Structures are given as C-alpha cells and as structure tokens.
Amino acid sequence: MDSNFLKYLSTAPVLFTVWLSFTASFIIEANRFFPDMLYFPM
Amino acid sequence: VPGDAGFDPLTISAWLDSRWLREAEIKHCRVAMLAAAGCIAQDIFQFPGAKMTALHDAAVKAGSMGQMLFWIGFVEAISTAATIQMLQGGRARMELSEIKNGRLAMIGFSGMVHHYFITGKGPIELLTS
Amino acid sequence: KKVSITVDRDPVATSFEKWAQPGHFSRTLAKGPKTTTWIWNLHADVHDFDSHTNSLEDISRKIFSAHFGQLSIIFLWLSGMYFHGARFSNYSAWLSNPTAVKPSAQVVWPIVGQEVLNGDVGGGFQGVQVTSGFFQIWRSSGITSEVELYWCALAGLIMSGLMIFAGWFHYHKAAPKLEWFQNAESMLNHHLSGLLGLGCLSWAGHQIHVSLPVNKLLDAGVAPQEIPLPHEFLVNRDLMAQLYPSFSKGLVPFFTLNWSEYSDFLTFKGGLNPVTGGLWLSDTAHHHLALAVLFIVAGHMYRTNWGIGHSMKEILEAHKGPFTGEGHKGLYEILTTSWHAQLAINLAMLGSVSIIVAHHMYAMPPYPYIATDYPTQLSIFTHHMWIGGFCVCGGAAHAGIFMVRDYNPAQNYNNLLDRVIRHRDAIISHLNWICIFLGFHSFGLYIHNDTMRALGRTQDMFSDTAIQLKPVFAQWVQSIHTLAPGNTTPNALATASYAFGGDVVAVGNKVAMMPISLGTADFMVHHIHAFTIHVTVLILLKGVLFSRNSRLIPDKANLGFRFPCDGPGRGGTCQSSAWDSVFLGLFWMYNCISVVIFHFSWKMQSDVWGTVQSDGTVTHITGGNFAQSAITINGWLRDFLWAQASQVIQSYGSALSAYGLIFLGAHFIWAFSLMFLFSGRGYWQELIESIVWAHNKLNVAPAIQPRALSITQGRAVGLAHYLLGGIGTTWAFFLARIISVG
Amino acid sequence: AKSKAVPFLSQPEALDGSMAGDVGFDPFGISSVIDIKWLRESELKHGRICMLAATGCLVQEVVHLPGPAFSQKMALNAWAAAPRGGMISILVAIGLIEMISNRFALTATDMFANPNRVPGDLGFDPLSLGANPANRARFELSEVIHGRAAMMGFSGMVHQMIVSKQAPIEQLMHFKAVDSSLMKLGGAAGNLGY
Amino acid sequence: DFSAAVPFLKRPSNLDGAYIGDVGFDPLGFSDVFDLRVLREAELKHGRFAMLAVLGFIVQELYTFPFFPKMAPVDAHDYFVKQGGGSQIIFWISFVELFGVVALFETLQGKREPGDFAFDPLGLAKDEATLERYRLAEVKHARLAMIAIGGFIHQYWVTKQTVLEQLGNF
C-alpha cells in the first residue's frame, strides 16, 4: 500500500477520528450485550 | 467538397464546421435512404407476423422499435466517438452518387410521409390508386 | 470566436504525497508546527486560495473543482434523503392518509434506551418525525411508491460520483485557463438560458406529463397502487386526454399560437387547491413554462461570438450622470478579476432569495398537504430565514475581503466605489441616526407599554384597545390584493394568497391558510424588524466602508482583513478590522432573525393555525393572544416563551425527549460561548503556563507548545458556540412545540 | 524473490528462512511493521497455549478430576462449573509465571533488551530434552507446526461447542447437522435492531 | 494510427499492444483516464467469475448434489441466501479477495501482471509461446462468458426456462 497514503492515515485527525470511533464503538457494543450496568456486579 | 453545386444560399458553411455539416448530411442521406426504401418495401411485401406513421406505435408496444433503438443507440455511441475523432483533428463518382440519391431519399421520404397525412396511405399504395 | 475553450492538460499530478504533508499549500504552514497555533492556522486559511497563490488562474481552477466537490456532497445528501424515504420511512402509509400519518424517515437503533425516540408517527410505524417536507415534495413529484424512491436515490449517487469525478478531472486532467473563466457574457447566457431556462422547461414537462395526471388521480381519491405508472401517461395519449381533454389536440395549438386550448392544464387559478391546501399544480406548470421562456429569452442578451448581443462593459460605462462621476466604469474589471467581489454579490442575493422563499412558501403553500403539516411549515420557514441571514452576512464579509485585498484605487478613480468611500462618514452617520431613531421608536414603544400596563394605565398604551398605531399601508396593500382577482388581475380566479384576505382554507379540519390581519402589534414588530435589519446593515456597511482606513487607523489595509487590533494606543483599537464587523454583525443578524421567526411562530399559532369545526369558526393554537399580548415584552416573555416552552421541558420520557435534551444542551453551548467572548487571550496563556509547568515537572510537556487561541480565534470560537447554542435552543423549542400541538 | 507460500506476492522482508516454520507467509506485511522477534514470541506463546487448550478440551471430555465441580464433559460448561477460587488461582499463577519467566522484561519496549534473549526461548527445558543440538532444528519446526495446528484446531473446537452444545469427541460421535433455523449470523442492523 | 478493431476510430494511445487481447477497442476512453493495470485486473476477474458462472449454470441443471434440493440457479441464489451456504461462499470469496487486495497493490507497485496469481497446478503453460496463446484464449473466453452470463440470467427472467431446456424447447 502507498507509503504516502499510510503517512496520511497516520496524521493526527485521522487517528483521532478512527481511535475514538473505535473506542466509542466498543462502548456501544458492550452496552448492547451487557446493558444497564449501574454497578460492578458483586 | 463532394456534391458542390455552389449551393449554400444562407451561408451555413460560414458558421458551422464543414466536417460536421458533411457528416450530418451523409447520415441524414443514409437514414432517409433506408427509410424511403423501407416505406416502399412494406407495400411491396411483408415480413411474417408483422402503416407508415401509426405503425411506429403499432411496433413500439411489441418492443421492436425499442430494441432497434437500443442497437442504433449502441452504434451511435461508437459513431459519436467517430465524429469526435474526426472533428478534434472511380470512387468519387460513387460518393457523389451516394450523396445525390440520399438527398433524393430525403425529398422522397418527406413526400411519402406527408402523403400519409393527406390520405392515410403508404407511397406506392396511393400511387396505385 | 474570441469565446473559446482553452484547457491545460494534465496540470497537477494525482499524488498522495501532499496529503502526507499537512499545510503544504502555504509557505508559513508548510515548514511544520512549533506551537499549537499552527494547527488552528492550518484549518483557518485552507480554502483562502488567494492567500496561497498569486495567480488568478490557479485560484480559479481550485474554485471550479471545489464547486464540483460541493455538488458531489449535495447529491450524496439528496440521495440519502431519498434512500431513507425509500427504506426507513412511512411514506407509503402517508400517501394513503396525508392528514393522519406524520412523516417519519429516520429510525434509531436500540442502544441505551434511545429507542424511545422511535415514537408512534402512524401507519404502523415507529421513527423520528421529519419536518423537511420531502413527503410533500415526492407527492408533488408524483412518486407514489418506495420503488421509485430507490431509483431517485441511485440517480443521486450516480450524479454524486460524476461530480466528484469532474472535480478531479477538471483540476488534475483538464483544467481550464483563466481566459475560459473570464467569459462573463457566455456564462450568463448559459446560466440564464441553459441552467435556469431549460431547468424550468424540463421541470414543467415533468409537471405536465407526470405531476399533473398523477396528482389529479390522487386528489380525486384513487389509491396510489391503483394509479397508472408515469410512462403510461406519456404513451397513452387517450388516457391523458381523459384527465385533460386538451391533450386530444396535441402540439398543434402550441405551434399555431392557439394557446387558449391548453387551459385545462395551463391555468391561472391562484389560491389553493381545496383538497390538499396547496397551490394548483396546473398553475405551477404554467408558472414554470412561462418562467422558462423568459429565462431562455434573457440568456440571449449578452454578446459572445456573433456580433449580436450586449457588451456588459458598455452597459456599465454608459450609466453615469451628474451626481456620480465616472459612473459604473471599472466595475466590469472588478467583477471579472475578483472572485470575492463576485461572491459578495452572489451571497447577498442568494441570502435575499432564501429570505423571500421563507415568506412565499408559508403564504402560498406550494406542495400538497404541506400547509396543514405545521411542523414542516415552521421548520422550512425558520430554516430558510437562517440560511438567508447567514448568507447576507457573508456578502459583507467578502465585500470586506475585496476592499482590503482586491481593491486598487488606480483603476477606481472617481467611479462609484471611489465616491462611496469618499463620503462614508455621511453614510455611516445617517445610518447611525436612523438606527437610534428606529430603536427608540420601535423598542421604546414596547417599554412604554410594559410601564403603562405595570402602572395600571391601560388607556395610555399603544394598543388596538387604546392609542392605535395601525399599519394602514400594509392593510391597504392587503385590500388591493384581495380586490385584484377580476379587477387588476382580471383572468385570475382567486387571490395569490389567502393571507391578504378572503376565505379560510381548511384541510382535514386544520387551517391551511386564512387572512393574516395586521394590527398595532403587527405595526410594532415590523418596526422592530426594520430596526434590527438597519443596525445589521450599519455594522456590516461600516466594516466594508472602513476596511482599508479610518480616522483612527490610517493604514488599516496594511494590517489586512482579519487582524485583532492595532494595539492599546489611540485609546484602544480592539476589534477594528473588517472581519470584526462581520463578527459583530452576525450577532445582530442572529438578533434580527430570532425576532422574525418568533414573530412568525407566535402569529401563525395565535391567528392562523388551528382547527375548524361547525359554524366555521377557527380555534387557534394559542387562541388569538398575539393582538393584546405581543405589545409588551412581558407578553413575549410570558405568553410566548414561557407558555410555549412547556412542551420541550415536559418532553422527557416521550419521543420528543431528544428535543428536551437538545434544549438543555444548546443552553449549555450558548453559555459556554461566553467564556470565549468575555475573556481575553492573556489570561489563558498565563493559566496554560502553570499547566505547562506541571507537565514539565512530570517530563510530559509536548513538543508542539500549547498556546491560548489567537485573539481572532477566541472571537470566532465564541461566536460559533453562541450561534450553535442560540439557534439550537430555538430549534428544539420550535420543533418540540409544533410537533406536540400542530 | 517471490514468496513460496504465496507465489504471486513478493517475499516479505524480515522473513529470510532462518526461523522455523518460515515459508514466506506474510501477505498483509505485518513483519514490515512489527519486529519479527515479537511476532515469533507471540506465535510460540499462542501456539503453546492452544496445544494445552486443545488437549484440555479432548482430555476433559475423557478424564475428570473427582467431584461434581469437575464433571463437565462439555469443556465450555467447565468454565462455569470449576471452582471460581481455583480458576482465579490459575489466573494469578499465570501472571506470576509471565513476570518471572520473562524476568521483568514484559513489554514491547523491554522484552529482548538483553541481546541473549531469543523469541520463544524462556530457558524452559526441565528434562534437558533439547540438549542434543542435532534434534534442535526439527524440534523448533515441529513446535511451531504443532502450535499453528492447535491454534486452528482449538478455534474450531470452541466454535463447534458454541454451534453444537456438545463436547468435541461426542459431537463427532453423535453428530447433528446445522439446521440454520437457529444461530443465523449477523442481523443486528438488518431488522433495525431488536 | 487507427484502431485495429474499429477502422474509423483512432487508437486510444494507452492501448499500444502492451496487453494480450488488445484490439484497440476503447471508445469511451476509460484508459485515457484510468490505470490500465487496474482495468485489466477487473477484466480478468469479471471474466473468470463469468466463466465459472456459465459452467455453474450448465452443470447445475445437469446435476445437483444429493444433500441440496433440486432447483433452478436463480432459485439457488435465493435459497442459499436464506439457507446459509451463500454467506459461506461470500465469506470465503472475501477471504481470498483480501490477498487479492494485496495482489492488486503488488500490480500497482509494478511487480505483477494484472491477472497473474501464479496458478498453474497442472503445468499446462509450457513456455512463452503457448502461454501467450493461452492468455489470449483466456481473455477471449472471459469476454465471451461475460456476454453469455447476461443472456442466461436475463433469458430465465423473461422466459422461466433454463438455458439447456430453452435450447431444447422453442
């Protein structure tokens, strides 16, 4: 894959948008399978 | 240059490409050649299972004209590539014969079609009566 | 043939290399960041092409390809609007019951309890109610099925792909030369004749052959799947002649000039269709056909390649009299060498047209069943007032950028610009006086009324009951327009709009339109409007007129369009730039448009919208309280903001709880903006120093040294969150209120 | 200079045929981004875990420790049945093993800090079975291969336990085909949720 | 010069006999705009799919596997959408297409012919001459099968008869 295109995807706004979309996405998935967790179950 | 009787009274040649004019004229010639010969041909004989102007709409419902349109449309797409590549950059008698009979075909086809408006008949059908 | 196509082939190489080098387009930013200011300066100046390049050719090329990119986004946006209508909407159920089903084309996923937003919009459907008026457009278009909405969605996607290809192609493969862009006669001929003229004519053809037959069958009552497909009207001319018998004669009446034969489908009815509460589509077809003709006629005015036509330079240089010096000389050179001067005009006109669209569409409802869909009527009025106000302020923004940069006094000696700048004190002092007079004599009438009503003196108030400030000129114009059918528009059958007077049009027992009476409250709030518009003109005109120099700063043009100040001296020159008048004028635009939409919202609920029942009387949404309560500020606070905020505050636990959350969220963003507006950069840099120290202590200081935002960016960030917060509050308040009650 | 595993791709750098199991397979080019030493450490570790895990599933089908808490033929059911205290004992002991066997060089920046450290070579040869240097190359090859095969095999066994609520050997001996009326893949967004 | 196929059309100029099967037919000039390596990769990929599809039809009428129900190939598409084997085929094709994405990057980077996957298990290609003739035959068959594919699916729609049974009847 082109190294200048990979250097473009390594730029701060793309990584910030991708990482926080990935981060938001597994919070969303964790609340789909395991909803309404007000407390650590113990 | 072929078929030059010095006949451009309105001087269209001054304000449109002569190559474009010749291409359009010869295309009109050949289309009208086919159309006029076909118009007389239908009254001479009929293809199995198959009059001038309303038969266009008798044929569109089958899908015949639509299919013919699709194939003319395909050929005309490659032919628009042809005219663009023309424009972006013992036989002369036969070219002149083609262009002369084609102008005659344009007159002839116009006659047959407006004869249809007059009498609701095809060309040689009316000629017979 | 001096109008010719000229193109440089393969100008710019399609490479990913400059993608990997953020800031490549300017000499300052291309050497990389050293402070965080670089990051903000990167986004701030990126589309300022004439700040990167000297040549007008490369600037014009960047603009042309960026306009294709914008078109690609709009087509993608339109394609998605059709797809959500095709796939996630109750459109088909709404076609059967336009007066019962609420349009909805957005369905949420069930994640954190947010599926409460999928409210019962009707038609066996759950979703977010949509107010953009697409359903009414599609029925006006004659769509009648989700299958056709999928084909429109694909048509948008194909267009979206073709525009992004053309933007790439015309920047990287075949970029036109400057002499191509500098063909103003050719561009105007084609955009009048080709774009607007063939646009209207083709749309008229769709209306005549598709919209008119399909909508006649719908308004007769035929079920949507019982209606013939749109091409069976195109072929079966007998079937089209059933609905409109003039089609039995074909195109002979058009060519022989026997146009009166076409009166079946080319009418001049006026008024509204009683069934749908919309404009007669036979009128809209005639409207677009007539508009098409004179746009095609208008596009033959200018001279291109055959000697016939006008030279626009000759027209301008000839219009000069004894008051105006050399006249319009040099204006052609300005408008064919400055993109900002062109953008200033076109933004002010597009903003004006968008404001006109807001007024014309509520008063003369063009789509079937859009007049009694009150959430849509409020939404599209409010949306097009904001688009207009924003675009108008950008017209003065780019008039300032022209004056600071593209203005050359040598080429503008004693012409209209030279003469405007040379009496700008007389203009700004007279406008300043008008705004003081207007504020005292519009808003001071409200303050007089607050005091008199508070003092127990209701006989001393400016009211219909007490001292009366009647709008006689507006009432008189309303009289004339009701008298116009059969008198000064003799062949019209009904009025242009029932707002002027006349009948009450009811659809599904809801008022479509009815006369909008004008009283003292209407006199008062119209002069409120004239005051807020004049002050907005005052702030923006003073910025354009004093952009290059003042008595304060004699060399303001050397500092640029956008500078924060020229120091604390001369008493203080904070906010002295032309950019800083756009900044201050967007607040007063916000103030202006906020009162317009509040005036519209309260007046339509109080005096127009509502329910009809036996005896024909109308029960309005807020029961006619506008006349006696819009004359005091306390009335606007109590009977408009407090009374109508009930729906958005009590919305929690319903499908409108999203509006309740956005109400609070926008109140937050607005207040948060005041942190940036009331504060200064010097405080925030010194606070950052201590924060940098704690990082230095832990050896975690960044190599891109943090800075407080620039003085200008603090103003830009404050204004942006103020606008986002202010407008977002009204958006939620308007939408939750009118969905609940209208 | 083409790959031997994937003949139409170029042979990846950092793969030179020195390592055991090196056949030129890295189409996605992770070796060009991630040091091959870390990748081989992680491959040997994943494979050693999966050899134990695949053997764990099959033997746990056949042989049990005494008691009702250890009587789960289906290995996925053993996760819940096995005493929690002892399961967390296993987890804590694994963590202690991870820190000590790696000698506190645990991370991506300090494992292999010692130039003597070799990928996968933790000093574990209790019975000195790798003492013979003649068997060394084929042991390294067959360790890598057993690890890869067991990764694939354990992955299959787990997801066949999910699909068929049966232990692996008695899923082979009491086979039932997939009806497709249950366990359809995806679909969270097709029906728009629920 | 003029196009070999269309005498009156000029040669495209990005089609100078570099690829086997080049008759200069490119009126739309997609090769004046787009990379011809990408276009040739797609040509051979579309054609190989079409060839497997036409054979896929023919064999599927003649025989079908005993564990699967007998039915027409379009009905097979819908049945295997709802049965689960369609997603199987989609997953494994997509899996191979991942390494195809790597392959296309290798082609763009200059190091691979557009349709070459080094897939010669039976050693049928012997030397340069037979390989050039084989790849000319592959291109010609690939284009022809693409045409053929449209015919079988569209004709089944218009007349609900299978390709072999449609030749057998009418």
Ligand code: CLA
């Ligand atoms: C242009 C306007 C527009 C808008 C505002 C929306 C908005 C929406 N759509 Mg619609 N849609 C549109 C156009 C639009 N669509 C078009 C044109 C199509 C046809 C293809 C569709 C087809 C469609 C379907 C089929 C569905 C939606 C759905 C949705 C909803 C959820 C979308 C979502 O979360 O997916 C999120 C999906 C992701 C993969 C997340 C991606 C997030 C990344 C990180 C964004 C990053 C962008 C990137 C960084 C940009 C830089 C590129 C890079 C090289 C640097 C939302 C209401 C869904 C819905 O309504 O369900 C009920 C749904 O199922 N849309």
Ligand code: CLA
């Ligand atoms: C009849 C001729 C014609 C037409 C229709 C247009 C149309 C347009 N021009 Mg103009 N232009 C013309 C001639 C024409 N131009 C000439 C001769 C010149 C040289 C002087 C220019 C120079 C020029 C510049 C410098 C710019 C434009 C821009 C634009 C777009 C304005 C934004 C807008 O409203 O788009 C939305 C409205 C639409 C209707 C979208 C339509 C998209 C296609 C291109 C319209 C035409 C399609 C086709 C002819 C219709 C086929 C009909 C068929 C189905 C029967 C618009 C597409 C601006 C732009 O946005 O650039 C992209 C711009 O910056 N034009």
Ligand code: CLA
């Ligand atoms: C056709 C419309 C049009 C066009 C082409 C331009 C083009 C331009 N303008 Mg003009 N402008 C316009 C409309 C337009 N403007 C309008 C309507 C206004 C009134 C607000 C202005 C006011 C204006 C000013 C005051 C200035 C410009 C400037 C510029 C130039 C720089 C653009 C740039 O780099 O910004 C880059 C773009 C951004 C940084 C985008 C961020 C902007 C906002 C804050 C984000 C949008 C918020 C979003 C819509 C809502 C968010 C949702 C939320 C809930 C999360 C460029 C020549 C500048 C200049 O120096 O020109 C020489 C300048 O100072 N313009």
Ligand code: CLA
């Ligand atoms: C409620 C808040 C408020 C008020 C009253 C004003 C008032 C005014 N602004 Mg300001 N402004 C505001 C908020 C406000 N602004 C904000 C938030 C911004 C931020 C962007 C600005 C930015 C701004 C700019 C940029 C400009 C103004 C201008 C004006 C003037 C408009 C002319 C006018 O109406 O004169 C009439 C005066 C009033 C309506 C004030 C209220 C007077 C009422 C009628 C009662 C008077 C009582 C009487 C004097 C009592 C006497 C006795 C007593 C002393 C005991 C006026 C002085 C413009 C200006 O000065 O040009 C003329 C101008 O250019 N303003």
Ligand code: CLA
């Ligand atoms: C600090 C030392 C310590 C102590 C005091 C305990 C104490 C206990 N353990 Mg724990 N345990 C420890 C370390 C320890 N454990 C470690 C390090 C591990 C991880 C390897 C475990 C894993 C473990 C499991 C999985 C279980 C216990 C259980 C128990 C309880 C019942 C013991 C019993 O009945 O034994 C008397 C019974 C025996 C001695 C039978 C022994 C069976 C053989 C020896 C097992 C085979 C070992 C196998 C080969 C492991 C090799 C790997 C290893 C070398 C790394 C008891 C509270 C059980 C429990 O929670 O009960 C409620 C239980 O199920 N332990």
Ligand SMILES: CCCCCCCCCCCCCCCC(=O)OC[C@H](COP(=O)(O)OC[C@@H](O)CO)OC(=O)CCCCCCCCCCCCCCC
């Ligand atoms: C080296 C290890 C190799 C791992 C190979 C993976 C094997 C299993 C993969 C799927 C098998 C077949 C799938 C068919 C099943 C299938 O396609 O179902 C379709 C499903 C969407 O549902 P639909 O819109 O199709 O609903 C259709 C209707 O018919 C039913 O409502 O697609 C998905 O999004 C599910 C996958 C989650 C997508 C996100 C995954 C998590 C993201 C993590 C980061 C990226 C990782 C890679 C993402 C691709």
Ligand SMILES: CC1=C(C#C/C(C)=C/C=C/C(C)=C/C=C/C=C(C)/C=C/C=C(\C)C#CC2=C(C)C[C@@H](O)CC2(C)C)C(C)(C)C[C@H](O)C1
């Ligand atoms: C190193 C060292 C030593 C040691 C040691 C040790 C503990 C050595 C143990 C090594 C082991 C446990 C190797 C196991 C490999 C398992 C494989 C390859 C299984 C692959 C399964 C497949 C392919 C499958 C499958 C399946 C599928 C999915 C479908 C299923 O329905 C069924 C089925 C089962 C057929 C000691 C400690 C002695 C000291 C020495 O000084 C140094």
Ligand SMILES: CC1=C(C#C/C(C)=C/C=C/C(C)=C/C=C/C=C(C)/C=C/C=C(\C)C#CC2=C(C)C[C@@H](O)CC2(C)C)C(C)(C)C[C@H](O)C1
């Ligand atoms: C490459 C490779 C290998 C391999 C391999 C493989 C699998 C090779 C398979 C190749 C195939 C399947 C070629 C098929 C081509 C089909 C064509 C051209 C279509 C013809 C249809 C026509 C003209 C028609 C029609 C018609 C229409 C549309 C409709 C009808 O009503 C009428 C009609 C019937 C007239 C192996 C593994 C051996 C190893 C080797 O080392 C490398």
Ligand SMILES: CC1=C(C#C/C(C)=C/C=C/C(C)=C/C=C/C=C(C)/C=C/C=C(C)/C=C/C2=C(C)CCCC2(C)C)C(C)(C)C[C@H](O)C1
């Ligand atoms: C959607 C969907 C399905 C499907 C499906 C599919 C795949 C349908 C197939 C679509 C295809 C492949 C259409 C292409 C047809 C080829 C054409 C028109 C070329 C004609 C040649 C021409 C015009 C000229 C040629 C020329 C002439 C003059 C002679 C000289 C040469 C040349 C210049 C070339 C299923 C089955 C999966 C089911 C599912 O439930 C829904």
Ligand code: SF4
């Ligand atoms: S630095 Fe700030 S306070 Fe000082 S003159 Fe400039 S804008 Fe005003």
